[PDB]
């Protein structure tokens, strides 16, 4: 018999992004080819199958620095990190291959699906 | 020129609640009249003006235990904590006064607004 506030999840995510922009309570640095990205472990886990697996590991859950595979493009990661905190994906002809490859590695199934669809439309 | 994934914010919140239910990466205990509630500081800040003020304080941001005012009802807090992680509010005739008072203390403006409206309808 609950009532539901429609905008609550969006408002929560907006506030989480405000904390990220001000670097408040960020607890991990993600290193991508020497580029560094600060974030909240819980948000990373909530959005990515890879971060979920990493931070549920009894040893890795305590790491303050995570280094990604050297094949990962920092711009592709930056676009996906922005998507995690906003629901908005900056998908462009020039970045779609790097974004799809990064989303496959991060295990972000819905992003992989839209990249596959946008690539299929261009062929 | 971004695209947006409609269900992303809801999916993030659903995963954050799954982490809460399994006690994964919870970093604070909220004490309410001897009852204890584990949660994520970032989610508490994202939902409440009071927790936002507490965890942006340079000394309180480092506390693992927060004790609420003894007038706060643990059931009212439990209902609001559930709302924070799900967007669903279990508002009933028997709990509405305790829920409104707790939401006013926690500074959860949208919850206070619906309680005021539901109380006004009953008079």
């Amino acid at each position: 018999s609950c009532i539901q506030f429609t905008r609550h999840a969006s408002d929560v995510l907006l506030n989480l992004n405000r904390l990220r922009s001000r670097d408040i309570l960020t607890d991990v640095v993600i290193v991508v080819s020497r580029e560094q990205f600060r974030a909240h472990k819980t948000v990373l886990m909530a959005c990515s199958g890879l971060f979920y697996s990493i931070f549920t590991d009894q040893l890795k859950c305590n790491l303050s620095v995570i280094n990604l595979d050297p094949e990962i493009n920092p711009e592709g990661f930056c676009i996906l990190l922005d998507f995690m905190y906003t629901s908005r994906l900056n998908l462009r002809e020039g970045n779609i291959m790097a974004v799809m490859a990064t989303a496959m590695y991060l295990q972000m199934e819905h992003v992989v699906d839209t990249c596959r669809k946008f690539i299929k439309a261009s062929e | 020129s971004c695209i947006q994934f409609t269900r992303h914010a809801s999916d993030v919140l659903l995963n954050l609640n799954r982490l809460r239910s399994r006690d994964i990466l919870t970093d604070v205990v909220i004490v309410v009249s001897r009852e204890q509630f584990r949660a994520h500081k970032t989610v508490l800040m994202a939902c409440s003006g009071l927790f936002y003020s507490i965890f942006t304080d340079q000394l309180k941001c480092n506390l693992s235990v927060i004790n609420l005012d003894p007038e706060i009802n643990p059931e009212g807090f439990c209902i609001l904590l559930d709302f924070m992680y799900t967007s669903r509010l279990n508002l009933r005739e028997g709990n509405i006064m305790a829920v409104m008072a707790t939401a006013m203390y926690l500074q959860m403006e949208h919850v206070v607004d619906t309680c005021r409206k539901f109380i006004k309808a009953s008079e």
Partner: peptide, 4 residues
Amino acid sequence: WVIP
């Protein structure tokens, strides 16, 4: 607010 809505009835979910």
